[PDB]
Design an enzyme around this catalytic site. Structure first.
Site, short mmCIF file in Angstrom:
data_model
loop_
_atom_site.label_atom_id
_atom_site.label_comp_id
_atom_site.label_asym_id
_atom_site.label_seq_id
_atom_site.Cartn_x
_atom_site.Cartn_y
_atom_site.Cartn_z
N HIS A 35 30.79 37.72 34.40
CA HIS A 35 29.66 37.47 35.34
C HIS A 35 28.86 38.75 35.68
CE1 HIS A 35 32.83 38.13 38.58
NE2 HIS A 35 31.81 38.81 39.12
N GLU A 78 36.69 35.06 31.29
CA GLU A 78 36.01 35.90 32.32
C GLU A 78 36.16 37.40 32.05
OE1 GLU A 78 33.70 34.54 33.96
OE2 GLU A 78 33.15 36.27 35.25
N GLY A 136 32.40 42.89 46.33
CA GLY A 136 32.55 44.33 46.09
C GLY A 136 33.82 44.67 45.32
N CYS A 140 35.08 42.89 42.56
CA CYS A 140 35.12 42.37 41.16
C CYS A 140 35.20 43.57 40.21
CB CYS A 140 33.99 41.40 40.85
SG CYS A 140 34.24 39.83 41.74
#
Length: 182
Positions: free
Chosen positions: A41, A72, A146, A148
């Site tokens: 992402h 991911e 904040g 990730c």
């Protein structure tokens, strides 16, 4: 404070950079040579900022399992003039549960941040932001925007990168040794 935080610090001090995309600032784990990982992402493009320096992306691969399900994890090869310490021998070979993990973050918002998250479950399937995702680890800590890209470690193992949360639990994508064979 103790040997879990010791291993986490050793990884942060040599194997992390601050990555900036158009989607934000992320903790980025360097794994070996010029190869690093970031949550998918982050939407890595042709150019990324690494510690506020404009850097060409030589390759970027959004990983999916053999059922074509999101993992991911994006693997990024950076046009950087310096190699990372090789930490592939700290990566697990198989999916597993863990005790006594630390989540470590280093950004402009959260410098030198370490969180003892405790027990880590092999959760498996998660609908992450609407996207079916596999190989998810879960910990019972109220993680925030904040974090990730944050690195999940135990003593002697680098087991995942933080990819999301629901307000009460946090979720990491597994790192496996087989992602980084060359």
């Amino acid at each position: 404070m103790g040997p879990g935080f010791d291993f986490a610090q050793a990884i942060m001090k040599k194997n992390t950079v601050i990555a900036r995309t158009e989607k934000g600032e992320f903790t980025m784990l360097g794994v070996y040579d010029r190869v690093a990982v970031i949550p998918t992402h982050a939407s890595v493009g042709e150019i990324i900022y690494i510690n506020d320096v404009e850097t060409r992306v030589l390759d970027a691969c959004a990983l999916r399992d053999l059922t074509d399900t999101n993992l991911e994890i994006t693997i990024v090869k950076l046009d950087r003039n310096q190699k990372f310490r090789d930490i592939r021998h700290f990566l697990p070979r198989c999916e597993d549960d863990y005790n006594d993990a630390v989540l470590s973050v280093h950004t402009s918002k959260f410098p030198n941040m370490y969180i003892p998250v405790g027990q880590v479950t092999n959760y498996g399937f998660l609908n992450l932001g609407g996207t079916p995702t596999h190989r998810i680890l879960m910990y019972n800590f109220p993680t925030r925007a904040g974090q990730c890209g944050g690195v999940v470690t135990t003593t002697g193992k680098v087991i995942g990168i933080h990819v999301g949360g629901n307000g009460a639990q946090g979720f990491a994508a597994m790192l496996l040794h087989s992602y980084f064979t060359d």
